[PDB]
Structure 1
Amino acid sequence: PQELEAYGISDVHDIVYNPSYDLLYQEELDPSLTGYERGVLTNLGAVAVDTGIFTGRSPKDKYIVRDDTTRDTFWWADKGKGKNDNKPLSPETWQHLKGLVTRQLSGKRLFVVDAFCGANPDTRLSVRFITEVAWQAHFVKNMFIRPSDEELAGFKPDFIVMNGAKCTNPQWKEQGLNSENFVAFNLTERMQLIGGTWYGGEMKKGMFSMMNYLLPLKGIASMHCSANVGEKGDVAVFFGLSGTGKTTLSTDPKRRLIGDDEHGWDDDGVFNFEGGCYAKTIKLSKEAEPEIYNAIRRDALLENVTVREDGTIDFDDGSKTENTRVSYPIYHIDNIVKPVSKAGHATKVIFLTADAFGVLPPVSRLTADQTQYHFLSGFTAKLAGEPTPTFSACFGAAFLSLHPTQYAEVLVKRMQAAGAQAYLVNTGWNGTGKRISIKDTRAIIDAILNGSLDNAETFTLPMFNLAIPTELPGVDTKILDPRNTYASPEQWQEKAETLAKLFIDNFDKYTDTPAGAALVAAGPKL
């Protein structure tokens, strides 16, 4: 109460510290709630909420305070080091933003959730989340690591996230900002402020960004990846941009899940930052993804899905957003690493990409130089219509706090010391104009992990110069060479050429060093 006053929040009468799952359930279904707070119970037993006007992140409202602690370390949007959302903020306008949130939260009933980001005591942040919306508390209780009672008794916050979603910033034009909304970070005060947007992904990726800053400065890879481990103890990580399959393909009933999204890699191996999973539900198939489907039950939190009058869910319905989601605590998945989400060094490193140009092969085993080249490129594409490219460095530039080369350097080191091999997987499109199936992709992931691919006869795909197999166990052979899916290889070539020029032009910004100039030869060549 006076502790809250120390944060700048006053006159808090009702404090819900560490809300249980049962309390959050009854908070969400309270029939007196109005607007975006309200939950509805679905027939699957999980509560569904609407996240409001924001249904995904708002990279354009993301600001980071430029002060002496961050000036010379951060990857800044305005210092010509290649395109990012780390936009500088003055300490003075930070203070204004902190007044808006702390006043909004004042005189309110507050939920206070204490949690960890990071599986290891040794590098984890102790985050205190403060919100006035029950489902937001529920989201952080799902997605972050839920402390022991003994960890709670000694809990000392290292980072404070104040979610003032209901407030907006009237002074933003004056202050040179993008909108009345804001997702701001202060590394001196160790705080994230959220204004205007209700969207929970802002806390999740917010703390991920903080880990991405802090970890590699002490030699630890910080990664936008899925991870799981085989009974054999073989660890795989799966990088990729949003919608490329990290969550979908790491939930494999044969392997134990470490996590679906955020992992670090230190002297002992790969560890999960999070305590939950955040699945996409657009067009969700019980048959194609039974583990994810069966995770949706009481304590899962559905977002933005359409719920029929009878409690049932139309999963195909994308009219509120295509980015429909469910969060659930990680133990809603039956086969997971426990009690601690971590395992050994990764020996298999998969770059997932959804290639809407329909050029790239379902799988190739990468050379050590292609591996960097592709890591820094960070390619995926969308049918926005109209194949639209995204090159996002390290398969997640949006969350990067340091220069992309700083993530590449540490990954390579970790990879080199474990003898790890890298693999590029197109989970996207063919010349069929259709996405390759979940089923063929799962069988390609098996072939990568069980050693079948490494021992396969391969040839070089031209232009991109990628080693691809002539056949694989459990995979339709026709799809393996991406040229087969067009009328003639010349129709694939036309597309390959357009795509290569995109990669070429994108990579240029890395060619200002030796090393980087040398990687161009690992790139697609016209």
Structure 2
Amino acid sequence: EELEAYGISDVHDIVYNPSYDLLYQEELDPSLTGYERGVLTNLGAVAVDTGIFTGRSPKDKYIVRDDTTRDTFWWADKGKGKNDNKPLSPETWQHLKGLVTRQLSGKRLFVVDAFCGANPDTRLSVRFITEVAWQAHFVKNMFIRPSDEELAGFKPDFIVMNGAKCTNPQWKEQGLNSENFVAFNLTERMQLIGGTWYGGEMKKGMFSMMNYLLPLKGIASMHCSANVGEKGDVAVFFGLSGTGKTTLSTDPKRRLIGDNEHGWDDDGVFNFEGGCYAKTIKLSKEAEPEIYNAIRRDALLENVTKREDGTIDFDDGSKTENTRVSYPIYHIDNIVKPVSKAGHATKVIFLTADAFGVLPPVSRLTADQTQYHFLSGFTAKLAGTERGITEPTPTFSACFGAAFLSLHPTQYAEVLVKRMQAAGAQAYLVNTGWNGTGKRISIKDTRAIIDAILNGSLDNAETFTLPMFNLAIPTELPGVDTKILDPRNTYASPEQWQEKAETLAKLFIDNFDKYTDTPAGAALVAAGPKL
């Protein structure tokens, strides 16, 4: 009955906050067809196929432009700088809402109530509606699970309606990218999904909403993982996709706060999420034992290859290289509990995967370099590996998360700088990507570098200035091969490094040009690379 307030009709069965045991039974029902079907692996975790979409679809993301959002959002068609916040008319929104609500009508529906945000004063109460059990399972893992008493007076602040099985046949007449859609309306406080079954759309959708509400309130909202040592020292790790946020924050010596989305308020750093979402391509249980051991009943594997005997081929990227496992955060043994939060960060680490092979494995940044690299948000990929030999493709994504920013990048920079300054925090740039060898730096060497950051080894090392980027790098560090610390050493001659460094420096300079129309931003050019 209460679902008719959202536009949904004739629902006979509501499955309200299903238990983990019920979701297991629902996923393994032998009568399911198509992409609803799950299969049981020998690790005890259920595995599913997410269908045509095996990752996010930024080209299909729209935000209703109305008097609530017109003058506050960072719009794709207005400011400087590329972003995916494409404006949507209220009229087209009503068309999309009718598509989704008719798809959900007459169905058996799963409804999951959950929180986004660890702190009662700023968290969003979210109600997710789906007709697919494993999608309800994804949101149960990834958001904060309310207690019985919190469900009693639950009042949603936001509604997410997942109409994955429907599509929009009028898209060409409406100026949209395709028949699929991921749409947000901040007047109605709703998210609609059509066409894509990929669960990450709901996770990153709610993160975009927190990126809108919080910085406005003086609270930093950060695309980062976070953890805390036995002495109470908090570290945060920013980074773009596949740079290592989950991998490197999940350390058995430190208590995990969270692996992907955090805020930073007057009391400290807090997780938005209740679970973890780890990349599993080529997963190695010797290199990632805590993540591998989280894969058991109530974890949800996505798009991995499951053999006839139920065993898992983690090396197989034939459906996608974005294979994934989600698990509630308590599948990790050493976490902060019962609430995922801690004090003020004193170490801020920017992870980048540099496929140009130019950046050092680690550098301590000056204050202005911190703002510069935060706004630049650089990473690069090997694009055409499949095409035999391949070259590198750069991404500049402001704040290491431009796909999720709802406000202008300088608004996130300003609140983050405020929090860092008050805590006496220091920032570091860590290349988890490539060097002159054409191979990624190993997880073992990356973990030893992080350890040397967190224990103050790096702070106390002798350093020199890497040219062009003007990055302070150490001459040596406990636990790390000394050779790799200077990226020039990993080439035959240092002139090979020089040529790539010049190519890369020019990409940074061109990218930063859009921030230099204010005085503060023009002054930051001096912190950036210099030809």
TM superposition score category, shorter chain reference = over 0.9
What is the CA distance between 1:80 and its match in structure 2?
A: 3.1
What is the CA distance between 1:183 and its match in structure 2?
A: 0.2
What is the CA distance between 1:81 and its match in structure 2?
A: 2.2
CA contact (8 A) 1:77 1:85 kept: yes
Residue 445 of structure 1 aligns to a residue whose secondary structure is helix
Task: Map Cα deviations across residues 446-479 of structure 1 (whole Å, 9 max, x no partner).
Answer: 0000000000000000000000000000000000
What is the CA distance between 1:348 and its match in structure 2?
A: 0.1
Alpha-carbon distance in 2 for matches of 1:375, 1:282: 28
- Mapping of 1:386-425 within 5 angstroms? 386-425=391-430
- Mapping of 1:224-239 within 5 angstroms? 224-239=223-238
Alpha-carbon distance in 1 for matches of 2:524, 2:50: 43
Task: Map Cα deviations across residues 51-79 of structure 1 (whole Å, 9 max, x no partner).
Answer: 00000000000000000000000000000
1:475 counterpart (471, 476, 480): 480
Whether 2:122 is the aligned partner of 1:117: answer no
- Mapping of 1:89-488 within 5 angstroms? 89-384=88-383, 386-488=391-493
Alpha-carbon distance in 1 for matches of 2:372, 2:325: 34
Alpha-carbon distance in 2 for matches of 1:138, 1:209: 21
Residue 515 of structure 1 aligns to a residue whose secondary structure is helix
CA contact (8 A) 1:372 1:408 kept: yes
Aligned to 2:502: 497
Residue 447 of structure 1 aligns to a residue whose secondary structure is helix
Alpha-carbon distance in 1 for matches of 2:332, 2:165: 33
CA contact (8 A) 1:302 1:326 kept: yes
Alpha-carbon distance in 2 for matches of 1:87, 1:156: 29
Matched residue count:
524
Alpha-carbon distance in 2 for matches of 1:433, 1:89: 43
What is the CA distance between 1:117 and its match in structure 2?
A: 0.2
Alpha-carbon distance in 2 for matches of 1:6, 1:503: 50
Task: Map Cα deviations across residues 471-509 of structure 1 (whole Å, 9 max, x no partner).
Answer: 000000000000000001111001100000000000000
Aligned to 1:87: 86
Alpha-carbon distance in 2 for matches of 1:52, 1:117: 26
CA contact (8 A) 1:305 1:314 kept: yes
- Unaligned runs of 5+ residues in structure 1 are none
Alpha-carbon distance in 2 for matches of 1:466, 1:213: 33
CA RMSD in angstroms comes to 0.4
TM-score by length of 2: 0.98
Residue 333 of structure 2 aligns to a residue whose secondary structure is coil
TM-score by length of 1: 0.99
**Which consecutive aligned stretches of 4+ in structure 1 deviate over 3 angstroms post-superposition?**
none
Task: Map Cα deviations across residues 100-159 of structure 1 (whole Å, 9 max, x no partner).
Answer: 000000000000000000000000000000000000000000000000000001100000
CA contact (8 A) 1:379 1:390 kept: yes
- Identity rate of aligned residues, in percent? 99
Residue 357 of structure 2 aligns to a residue whose secondary structure is coil
Task: Map Cα deviations across residues 146-180 of structure 1 (whole Å, 9 max, x no partner).
Answer: 00000001100000000000000011100100000
CA contact (8 A) 1:75 1:81 kept: no
Alpha-carbon distance in 2 for matches of 1:247, 1:320: 22
What is the CA distance between 1:87 and its match in structure 2?
A: 0.2
Alpha-carbon distance in 2 for matches of 1:41, 1:388: 38
CA contact (8 A) 1:347 1:418 kept: yes
Alpha-carbon distance in 1 for matches of 2:33, 2:276: 28
Alpha-carbon distance in 2 for matches of 1:6, 1:353: 45
CA contact (8 A) 1:227 1:258 kept: yes
Alpha-carbon distance in 2 for matches of 1:282, 1:368: 36
Residue 277 of structure 1 aligns to a residue whose secondary structure is strand
Alpha-carbon distance in 1 for matches of 2:291, 2:411: 34
Aligned to 1:59: 58
Residue 393 of structure 2 aligns to a residue whose secondary structure is strand
Task: Map Cα deviations across residues 323-360 of structure 1 (whole Å, 9 max, x no partner).
Answer: 00000000000000000000000000000000000000
Alpha-carbon distance in 2 for matches of 1:299, 1:280: 17
Alpha-carbon distance in 1 for matches of 2:365, 2:525: 15
Residue 336 of structure 2 aligns to a residue whose secondary structure is coil
- Unaligned runs of 5+ residues in structure 2 are 384-390
What is the CA distance between 1:28 and its match in structure 2?
A: 0.5
Alpha-carbon distance in 1 for matches of 2:182, 2:220: 25
CA contact (8 A) 1:163 1:195 kept: yes
CA contact (8 A) 1:163 1:193 kept: yes
CA contact (8 A) 1:48 1:304 kept: yes
Aligned to 1:46: 45
What is the CA distance between 1:398 and its match in structure 2?
A: 0.2
Task: Map Cα deviations across residues 423-453 of structure 1 (whole Å, 9 max, x no partner).
Answer: 0000000100000000000000000000000
Alpha-carbon distance in 1 for matches of 2:277, 2:246: 8
Alpha-carbon distance in 2 for matches of 1:29, 1:406: 46
Task: Map Cα deviations across residues 32-60 of structure 1 (whole Å, 9 max, x no partner).
Answer: 10000000000000000000000000000
Aligned to 2:387: none
Alpha-carbon distance in 1 for matches of 2:311, 2:395: 35
Residue 221 of structure 2 aligns to a residue whose secondary structure is strand
Alpha-carbon distance in 2 for matches of 1:43, 1:62: 37
CA contact (8 A) 1:111 1:133 kept: yes
Residue 459 of structure 2 aligns to a residue whose secondary structure is coil
Task: Map Cα deviations across residues 244-287 of structure 1 (whole Å, 9 max, x no partner).
Answer: 00000000010000000000000000000000000000000000
